[PDB]
Each structure stands twice: as structure tokens, then as C-alpha cells.
Design a protein around this ligand. Structure first.
Ligand SMILES: CCCC[C@H](Cl)CCCCC(=O)SCCNC(C)=O
Ligand SMILES: CCCC[C@H](Cl)CCCCC(=O)SCCNC(C)=O
Lengths: 368, 367
């Protein structure tokens, strides 16, 4: 399977990280929440993000959850349509010649976003769809793997994957309600301190955006040398870590416990060592890593586990700095950057790695 | 690709339709809602459901728990049902979990991580198990998942995959229907249609789980006499998103009366195109397995294809026994066919389901 091209789409409002930190501090202050405001600055600074796109409005006067979901759906569709149209235009592919449209998003959508897009883009009415959910930050890498598996059996076909997330939905009421309750119960329940920090970290980290990728089977006319080929992929799920990472219905609450970066270690090396060995490759001979930046702590952990030079994962840090954590879309944005870089040397190997709720990890071996 | 075996799983409480009708009437009465109570009984009777399984409680109908606690219970019941069905499937086929390569799931139960990921802590699947967690397909999910697993197994002829579908319709009885029927009846003659649609939702949808084991052609279990998936196809009717789906409000089920008429735009284009490309006609089909997805749907398929009054009886009997269990329904029906019926060698069958989109899915089977 060949990765042919990529595109991204972002909403119109880009906020400096310092403005978002200030917006949350003002919420704490207007609400008279008894909490150290310097903790907001600390985590908004320590995530190493310069600014974020928010599709939904920037705390004090929240709409109904129904209205926020309606806006989230609309914005998800708008971003996905933009990305897919840019993708089709840049490759000169007609929508009717796409066989499969795969999607990942935690935006609630029944019918799925990919079905609603059939009314915006003239796909054939018999388009095959692959709407995935329950994978969180991992979804971009996960979707690449599932589409590659599909194209194994359909070598003449073309498929599009998109990932789109609206993290700003959490700023429409969920973060406000939860931080208020937690901080006000904190004097009688000091165990809640870590819960407040988790919500502040969520507010510091997650952003909005969309990425899309065109992939084709080996017999497709766009399967040309010089493109990255997906040569293998593998999944891993670490036992008994469901509670470390997820998205719970309450609005929503993001779950991201500090123990993630250590539980990551239990899955990363068996997953990647096994994938590489089964393909007769040594990690030291990888030309490129494309690692989803769950956080700076996650990047540091991957770097330490595989003894990497600190420049090897620079793309993860630059991406975090530019757009924040855009969840499943992040590795597609990252792949897009790489496809804009200098033509990778022939026969160079690359690894895409992402981690998400599960705790689950996905690894994809690429060859140029 | 072969369908090797099926299983089902249901919660402990089976309620007669009259008991459910009575509970809803009691709600209208305690709340002093000004609405003809005979509309409740008429719709609960006219869907021709004898009873339904509810995993979530009915006794709290007047004082429902919080939506957060309902979701947590819905997750736990979803996991329990899927674990039970999967375990029965593995036991009846003598297949070890470690020997399953792909676990595919469909469910509207909110789950991040997905149900299939969570199930890896209850069933000793390999840690490198491949997963296919689908959503956004509603009632079409069981047929949809069969097609997607079939496409996967085309590329993996040595492998075995499990699909499960599970839905907890009783979630809507934990506050959503109560709130919406109250407000709607209070308020605007144009709102009569909205109340009817919530009453029909309350009359129709039920809980359950189905599971299927499928293998590629080179798997040891791939044996003659098992149904083969020979082809499958999807169809989405343009500009009908608003006719069916599930909206966040709790949840509100959307099922517009126009659905059955809108199905006519997709059914024959889908099925006759699929059959023609496999060199057969619909009249060649020995068995139909059609999801019973809302008023007039069965009747509409029957009319479109000129079928005899008994060709779709399995749809009606299924609705009678367990109601509309959404994505799981066609797996329960396939289970009945494989376990209780005789299928002549080399005969053709068609699985058909319809769901939010408006989308339809067809799968051609050959024994
Ligand atoms: C508008 C529709 C509502 C969208 C809801 Cl709020 C999706 C959550 C968005 C925030 C994230 O993407 S958090 C990514 C890391 N979290 C996990 C579980 O991996
Ligand atoms: C379990 C927690 C919330 C899950 C929700 Cl309440 C399940 C959906 C409502 C009951 C059904 O199965 S309706 C099937 C027809 N409707 C569609 C969209 O196809």
C-alpha cells in the first residue's frame, strides 16, 4: 500500500497559548476559585505549545451541551470537507474514483461524519465507509493501519482517511463545571488535587484540527516509487490500563493520568521491537520516526526507551509547539510535514507510532 | 470467506410489551401529561413485539439516576453481554482467544476506549489483537460489520475474526424519553409528530448482543456447507441525514415516518446491482434475512421485491420475540437460521439492513 498525499484543515481562530492560559485564569478569578493560579501558567507553559486552533468559542457563559454538539458536528464536517477537497484537488482524483472513505473522530455522529460528507462531495452512492471510534489520540495511526489492511485485498483501489477532533468542545462547559466542583470540594477532600491538575493539563494540551491522507493499492496508477509504502503494522494493548486514558461521559471528561507515560513503556518496546524484528530491521537503522506527541513526557519516554538522539523526535515537539495536541489528527499533520520535506533516500525506513485509550499503541513501518 | 458460527447474549430481565406499555402510561399519569393514553397502547401493540429485554432498570422510571451513572451501567452491561456472547462462540467452536486475529465491534454505547479494547482484559486475547471498532451506523451495524470483516478476511485467508454487536436501548428509559415527552406534551400543534416519534421509540427498541465467527478460505474451520460471504455492497441515500439517527440532547432517537418511503430509493439500486454483478436475480434467493428496522420497513421490502407474504417472516418473528435490538438484530436472525433451519446446499441468501445515513447494506451468502 502506498501513501500518495496528505492535507490538513484548521478552523479560523488561532489563539496564543498565553491568551488561553489567561482566559482560564480569568475564569478561576471571576468564580473566586481557591486554587493557585500559578499552576495554570505552569502547565500551560510546560506542555511546550505556542498556540492552538479553537473551532468553538472562547468559559464564562456556556451554551447547552446539545448546541455545542451541534456546532462540533458542523465544524467537524466543515474541516473534513476542506481537507478532503484539498486532497482530491492536489492529486487530481475524482471523488467517484475513491472506493473507501475511512474516518476517526470522537465527535458524536450517528450517522458518522463520512456518511454526512457524501452529501457535500460527489462520492458514488456505493462508497465503502469505515467509521472508527473508541481510539482517541491513536486514531490517525490506527486508521492508516486499517486502510492499509483493506488495500491489501483491493490493490486497484484508492481510499481516503480523515481524522478530525474538536477539543474546544471541552471549553464549552465541561471543564468549567468540573474544575469548579473539584476546587470547591478540595478543602474537605485533598485527594481531589490530582483531579484538578488533570483537568488543567487537559485545558493546556488539546486543540482542534483535521488531517486527511490518500492511500492506494499497489496496482493503482498513483502507486509510484518515492512514495512511502506501508509494509507492516501492529497493535498493542497494555492489560488493565483502561482507567489511565479515555473520554468519559458525565458533557465529557478527558481522562489522562500521570501514570500513562510509565504504562506506555510496557507496550512500546514489545510492540516496536517485535514489528521491527519480524521485518528484519534494527531500530538504529530507521531513517525517520513520526511519533504522536501525547505530551512532552510521552516524547521523552519514547526517546529514552529507544535511546534516540534528541533530534530524532524534533517533529513531535515542533508539531506540539505549532498546533498543540490535535489528538487523532496530529500524526496526519505530522506526516503531511514529512511529505513536504526533502525526498527521503530510496529504501529508507520510517516508523509511525501513536498511543491512546486502551492503553493502546499502534506502529506502522514505512519504506520509501 | 466463511461464516463459521454465531451466538447471542441477553440481559436477565425480559418484559412483556404490555408491562412496558403500562410503565409508560404510569409515567404519563403520575406526571399528569395531557395526551391520549390509548396512543401509547396502540403503538406498543402495533409494532407487533411480544416482549423486550432491558439491561437497565425499569423500576426507577419516575426517579431516574444521573446520565453519568446510566452510561456507566450501560458500558458495564455492554461489556457483560459481549463477553458472554464471545465466550459462548469460542466454546462452541473450540477456538482459543489467542487464535483470533481480529475483533470487530459495533455499538452506540459511548466507549473511549472501545468495547473491544476493554474486552481484552476479560478474555485472554493476544495483546497484538487487531481491532475494528465501528460506530455511527446504528441499526445497520450488524450487517455493516459482516461486510467489513469479510473485506478484511479477503486479505487474510488464514485468519479468524470475531464480530460482535451490542446495544442498550433501555438507556433511553433512564431519563431521555421522560424529559422529552414531558416538555413536548406541555408545549404548538406541530409537536404532535414529535411525541409520536418518541412513543414509537419507546415501543420499538430493545437490548441484546450478537456475535459471529468468520474465517478466511485457508483456515482449518473453512468447510463446505458453511455459508460463504460471496459479495457485499453499501448504499447511502442522498440528503436523508435528518430522517434517522441518534442525537445528543441524554440521547434522542430520530426515526422519521418518511424513512420507509426513503428506503425505496436505495433498496433496489443496491440489491439488484449487487445481484446482477454476481450473475443472479433476486428471485434466485432462497433466504432473506432483513433487519426489521421500523414501521412499514418489512412491508416495504416485501413490496419492492414482490415477495411472498412469508419470505420475510423471520423478520416479524424476531421482532415478536426480542423487539428491535438495533445492530444486533440481524445477527440474532442469522443465528436462528444457522441453528434452527435447513439451508439447501448451494442456495443463496441475502442479509439486508438499513440505518442512519440513510444507509443500506446488503451481503450475498451462498451455502
Ligand atoms: C464536538 C464533539 C465533542 C468532541 C469531544 Cl470533547 C472529543 C474530545 C476532544 C478532546 C480530545 O480530542 S482529547 C484526546 C486525548 N483524549 C483521548 C481520550 O484520547
Ligand atoms: C447505551 C448508552 C446510549 C446508547 C443509545 Cl441510547 C442506544 C441507541 C438508542 C437505542 C437504539 O438502539 S436505537 C436504534 C435505531 N436508532 C439508530 C440511530 O439507528
Amino acid at each position: 500500500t502506498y501513501i500518495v498525499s496528505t492535507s490538513t484543515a484548521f478552523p479560523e481562530n488561532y489563539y496564543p497559548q498565553t491568551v488561553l492560559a489567561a482566559a482560564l485564569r480569568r475564569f478561576f478569578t471571576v468564580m473566586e476559585l481557591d486554587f493557585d493560579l500559578e499552576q495554570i501558567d505552569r502547565f500551560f507553559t510546560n506542555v511546550k505549545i505556542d498556540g492552538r486552533y479553537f473551532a468553538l468559542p472562547l468559559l464564562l457563559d456556556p451554551p447547552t451541551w446539545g448546541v455545542s454538539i451541534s456546532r462540533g458536528l458542523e465544524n467537524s464536517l466543515n474541516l473534513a470537507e476542506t481537507a478532503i477537497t484539498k486532497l482530491l484537488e492536489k492529486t487530481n482524483v475524482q471523488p467517484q474514483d475513491i472506493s473507501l472513505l475511512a474516518s476517526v473522530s470522537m465527535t458524536p455522529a450517528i450517522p458518522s461524519l463520512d456518511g454526512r460528507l457524501m452529501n457535500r462531495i460527489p462520492f458514488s452512492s456505493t462508497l465503502k465507509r469505515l467509521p472508527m471510534n473508541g481510539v482517541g489520540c491513536m486514531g490517525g495511526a490506527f486508521g492508516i493501519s486499517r486502510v492499509a489492511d483493506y488495500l491489501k485485498a483491493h490493490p486497484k483501489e484508492a481510499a481516503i482517511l480523515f481524522a478530525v477532533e474538536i477539543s474546544s468542545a471541552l471549553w464549552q462547559g465541561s471543564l468549567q463545571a468540573n474544575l469548579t466542583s473539584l476546587i470547591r470540594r478540595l478543602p474537605e477532600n485533598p485527594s481531589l488535587y490530582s483531579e484538578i491538575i488533570m483537568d488543567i493539563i487537559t485545558a493546556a494540551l488539546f486543540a482542534d484540527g483535521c488531517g486527511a491522507v490518500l492511500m492506494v493499492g499497489k496496482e493503482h496508477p498513483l502507486a509510484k516509487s518515492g512514495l512511502p509504502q506501508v509494509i507492516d503494522n501492529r497493535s498493542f494493548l497494555v492489560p488493565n490500563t483502561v482507567e489511565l486514558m479515555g473520554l468519559d461521559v458525565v458533557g465529557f471528561r478527558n481522562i489522562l493520568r500521570p501514570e500513562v507515560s510509565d504504562a506506555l513503556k510496557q507496550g512500546l518496546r514489545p510492540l516496536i521491537n517485535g514489528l521491527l524484528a519480524d521485518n528484519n530491521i534494527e531500530s538504529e537503522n530507521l531513517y525517520r520516526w513520526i511519533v504522536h506527541p501525547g505530551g512532552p513526557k510521552v516524547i521523552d519516554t519514547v526517546e529514552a526507551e529507544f535511546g534516540l538522539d534528541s533530534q530524532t523526535l524534533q517533529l513531535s515537539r515542533d508539531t506540539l509547539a505549532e498546533v498543540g495536541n490535535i489528538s487523532s489528527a496530529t500524526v496526519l499533520y505530522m506526516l503531511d510535514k514529512v511529505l513536504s520535506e526533502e525526498q527521503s533516500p530510496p529504501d529508507s525506513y520510517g516508523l509511525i507510532v501513536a498511543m491512546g485509550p486502551g492503553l493502546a499503541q499502534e506502529a506502522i513501518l514505512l519504506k520509501w
